[PDB]
Amino acid sequence: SFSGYLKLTDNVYIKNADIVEEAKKVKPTVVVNAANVYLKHGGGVAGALNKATNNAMQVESDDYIATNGPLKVGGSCVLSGHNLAKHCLHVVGPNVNKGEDIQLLKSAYENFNQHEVLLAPLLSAGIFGADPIHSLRVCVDTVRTNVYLAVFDKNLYDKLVSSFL
Ligand SMILES: O=C1CC(I)=CC=N1
Structure with a gap:
């Protein structure tokens, strides 16, 4: 299963x-994508x-978009995980x-609760412009299922662990 993760809370x-390398190595049941409402996978995660x-x-x-139209901000959809995972849960932070x-x-993180275990990035962090410290706090206070967060940036990772209440 997942290795080298630092436990923050019960879950x-x-x-x-x-996160790409984590997904290829583990091939988890669910990999979360930091999606936009159009599912236009241009940059970031x-x-x-x-x-x-x-x-x-x-x-x-x-x-998917041709059939269903765009997602809502805070919403999600389950698609194939291709060569990375069984499924990809595209979540719009x-x-x-x-x-x-x-x-x-908080609505965006609620989507994680429909899956027992997930490999995920911090929602709305990076190019989405939110404070990653705030995103981690919303994550631990919202997600009740097992979430394995992959943080790309080492300096941010250190800051998140060192400041975690
Ligand atoms: O190129 C990238 C960006 C990010 I954020 C995570 C993994 N690969």
Whole structure:
């Protein structure tokens, strides 16, 4: 299963790792994508996960959007995990850089509760513009299922562990 994770709470674990590399090594049941409402996997975690699937995630996502329309901010959808996981839970955290409401971060993390165990990034962190310390606090206070957080940035990882209440 997952290795080298630091236990934060009863159910939240954290590691300084590239989520693509974590997914290829573990091949978890669920890998969470930091998605936008259009499932346009351009940059950040989404661009990286999609590129690891040789664009298969984008092809599948475009078919999903053609059929169903866009997701809601705070919403999610379950798609194939391709070569990374059994499934990919595409979760839309609020993008602060696009003026979206940070209050929706709790709704976004609520999606994780429908899955027993997940490999995930910190929602709304990185290019989404929210404070990662706040995202980790919402995560531990919202997610009740087992979440293995992969934090790409080492300096951020250290700051998150050292400041965790
Ligand atoms: O290139 C990337 C970005 C991020 I954020 C996580 C993993 N790979």
